[PDB]
Design a protein around this motif. Structure first.
Motif, PDB file in Angstrom:
ATOM      1  N   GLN A 138      -5.056  -9.406  -1.055  1.00  0.00           N
ATOM      2  CA  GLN A 138      -4.874  -9.220   0.380  1.00  0.00           C
ATOM      3  C   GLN A 138      -3.478  -8.726   0.781  1.00  0.00           C
ATOM      4  OE1 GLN A 138      -6.718  -8.954   2.877  1.00  0.00           O
ATOM      5  NE2 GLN A 138      -8.496 -10.292   2.777  1.00  0.00           N
ATOM      6  N   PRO A 139      -3.238  -7.412   0.882  1.00  0.00           N
ATOM      7  CA  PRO A 139      -2.023  -6.877   1.501  1.00  0.00           C
ATOM      8  C   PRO A 139      -1.953  -6.854   3.017  1.00  0.00           C
ATOM      9  CG  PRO A 139      -2.200  -5.859  -0.500  1.00  0.00           C
ATOM     10  CD  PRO A 139      -3.480  -6.636  -0.330  1.00  0.00           C
ATOM     11  N   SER A 140      -3.001  -7.246   3.736  1.00  0.00           N
ATOM     12  CA  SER A 140      -2.909  -7.404   5.179  1.00  0.00           C
ATOM     13  C   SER A 140      -1.923  -8.550   5.524  1.00  0.00           C
ATOM     14  CB  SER A 140      -4.307  -7.700   5.690  1.00  0.00           C
ATOM     15  OG  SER A 140      -5.278  -7.003   4.936  1.00  0.00           O
ATOM     16  N   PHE A 141      -1.464  -9.351   4.551  1.00  0.00           N
ATOM     17  CA  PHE A 141      -0.517 -10.409   4.790  1.00  0.00           C
ATOM     18  C   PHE A 141       0.928  -9.964   4.724  1.00  0.00           C
ATOM     19  CE2 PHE A 141      -3.836 -13.701   3.185  1.00  0.00           C
ATOM     20  CZ  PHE A 141      -4.543 -13.548   4.377  1.00  0.00           C
ATOM     21  N   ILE A 142       1.307  -8.999   3.881  1.00  0.00           N
ATOM     22  CA  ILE A 142       2.692  -8.535   3.904  1.00  0.00           C
ATOM     23  C   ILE A 142       2.815  -7.481   4.975  1.00  0.00           C
ATOM     24  CG2 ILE A 142       4.413  -8.663   2.146  1.00  0.00           C
ATOM     25  CD1 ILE A 142       1.591  -6.297   1.494  1.00  0.00           C
ATOM     26  N   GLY A 143       1.858  -6.578   5.022  1.00  0.00           N
ATOM     27  CA  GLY A 143       1.860  -5.467   5.944  1.00  0.00           C
ATOM     28  C   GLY A 143       1.880  -4.231   5.059  1.00  0.00           C
ATOM     29  N   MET A 144       0.686  -3.678   4.797  1.00  0.00           N
ATOM     30  CA  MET A 144       0.473  -2.498   3.974  1.00  0.00           C
ATOM     31  C   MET A 144      -1.005  -2.149   4.041  1.00  0.00           C
ATOM     32  SD  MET A 144       2.906  -3.187   0.908  1.00  0.00           S
ATOM     33  CE  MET A 144       2.224  -2.559  -0.592  1.00  0.00           C
ATOM     34  N   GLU A 145      -1.402  -1.012   3.491  1.00  0.00           N
ATOM     35  CA  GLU A 145      -2.797  -0.614   3.488  1.00  0.00           C
ATOM     36  C   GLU A 145      -3.360  -0.804   2.094  1.00  0.00           C
ATOM     37  OE1 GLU A 145      -0.628   2.962   4.160  1.00  0.00           O
ATOM     38  OE2 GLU A 145       0.253   1.083   4.706  1.00  0.00           O
ATOM     39  N   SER A 146      -2.570  -1.313   1.148  1.00  0.00           N
ATOM     40  CA  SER A 146      -3.058  -1.508  -0.198  1.00  0.00           C
ATOM     41  C   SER A 146      -4.199  -2.500  -0.141  1.00  0.00           C
ATOM     42  CB  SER A 146      -1.998  -2.069  -1.122  1.00  0.00           C
ATOM     43  OG  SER A 146      -0.803  -1.301  -1.095  1.00  0.00           O
TER      44      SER A 146
END
Ligand SMILES: Nc1ncnc2c1ncn2[C@@H]1O[C@H](COP(=O)(O)OP(=O)(O)O)[C@@H](O)[C@H]1O
Ligand SMILES: [Ca+2]
Length: 375
Positions: A263-271
């Motif tokens: 889950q990269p929606s937690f750091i801030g990214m589209e990965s």
């Protein structure tokens, strides 16, 4: 060494240098690749025995030190500490001259063009090493696990990599690279810790954030569901009374930081997580190549050592892939030293001789000898 040629094997990355001799199972000399310097100041008469406190010595007397990190994600911040790092390895633990044996290292896959030469120079032009090879991580693993085709995902500390490998090797066109790995999990922790009211913001405390992590924080099996289980003060909360003195009751942070891998929606990214970048590698190849990649998904490094991880990918991977098959994650009992044990074999087989850079080949081919033999 003694009746045979022999050599030294070495996996070095962004977090641990793991050195040994050759033929060996798993490591002998091992130390964090860092050089510490005295940030605490004051003056001296008695002094805690160092100018550069290095690796092990460093991590042990943390407080006075400003731990100059080097190889953050394969890129080194500045190379100057590094020579002292390797000054440990050979002479201090192993007691062997580099100027005597073959050296095996690892290519931290897609470490820049010039770094290949710059490394070989530190050996061959500065510390005259007789023969060396740096082996490209993920693939080594495969053979030690007794696999020829599969999709390997190997990440330790520094950089995420999803490698499709088959009975023949991968190519840049399908393999991927991402910066979201083991050490980023390490560091990430503090971004989130704020909401309880903690932020080990500085150097020595930075290293305590790594330490906490590997021996207690676990991966959420299905985060969303587990979020209500954050109410269950049993599973989650646990005491980390710091042997200095301060309790870190690592509650939800124990799986919230692991989850960032999928889950990269937690750091801030589209990965997308490493479960989707695994589809991303696998699709890009030839049409007939995937059936056995899917039959064995090799999972290695410092990254795949957390409690509850293979199991996760068992669910997740099916959802956006090809449907037809016996999908199966192979994560060996110890799967972290993947790089090392696969490498051991190569630098124990004498057949390896129809490859490497040997001492005079460098001179006879200038710095560029590394891209004249390898790539
Ligand atoms: N038991 C473990 N569980 C999870 N993280 C671990 C564990 N062992 C070490 N790590 C982490 O793995 C990283 C070091 O892995 P390593 O394979 O030694 O090196 P690198 O890929 O840089 O070559 C660090 O983030 C360390 O905190
Ligand atoms: Ca590594």
């Amino acid at each position: 060494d003694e009746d045979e040629t022999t050599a030294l094997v070495c996996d070095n990355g962004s977090g641990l240098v793991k050195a040994g001799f050759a033929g060996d199972d798993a490591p002998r000399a091992v130390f964090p690749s860092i050089v510490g310097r005295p940030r605490h100041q004051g003056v001296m008469v008695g002094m805690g025995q160092k100018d550069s406190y290095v690796g092990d010595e460093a991590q042990s007397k943390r407080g006075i030190l400003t731990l100059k990190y080097p190889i953050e994600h394969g890129i080194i911040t500045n190379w100057d500490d590094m020579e002292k790092i390797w000054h440990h390895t050979f002479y201090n633990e192993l007691r062997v001259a580099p100027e005597e044996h073959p050296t095996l290292l690892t290519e931290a896959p897609l470490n820049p063009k010039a770094n290949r030469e710059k490394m070989t120079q530190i050996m061959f032009e500065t510390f005259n090493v007789p023969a060396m090879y740096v082996a490209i991580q993920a693939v080594l693993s495969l053979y030690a696990s007794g696999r020829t085709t599969g999709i390997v995902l190997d990440s330790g500390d520094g950089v995420t990599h999803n490698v499709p490998i088959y009975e023949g090797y991968a190519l840049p066109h399908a393999i991927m690279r991402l910066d979201l790995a083991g050490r980023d999990l390490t560091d990430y922790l503090m971004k989130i810790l704020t909401e309880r009211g903690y932020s080990f913001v500085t150097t020595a405390e930075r290293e305590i954030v790594r330490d906490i992590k590997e021996k207690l924080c676990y991966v959420a099996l299905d985060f969303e569901n587990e979020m209500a289980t954050a109410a269950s003060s049993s599973s989650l909360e646990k005491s980390y009374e710091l042997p200095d003195g301060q309790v870190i009751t690592i509650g939800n942070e124990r799986f919230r930081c692991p989850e960032t891998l999928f889950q990269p929606s937690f750091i801030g990214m589209e990965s997308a997580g490493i479960h989707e970048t695994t589809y991303n590698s696998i699709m890009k190849c030839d049409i007939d190549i995937r059936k056995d990649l899917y039959a064995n998904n090799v999972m290695s490094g410092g990254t795949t050592m957390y409690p509850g991880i293979a199991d996760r990918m068992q669910k997740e991977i099916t959802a956006l892939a090809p449907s037809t098959m016996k999908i199966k994650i192979i994560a060996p009992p110890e799967r972290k030293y993947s790089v090392w044990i696969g490498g051991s074999i190569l630098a124990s087989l004498s057949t390896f001789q129809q490859m490497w850079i040997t001492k005079q080949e460098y001179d006879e081919a200038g710095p560029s000898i590394v891209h004249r033999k390898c790539f």
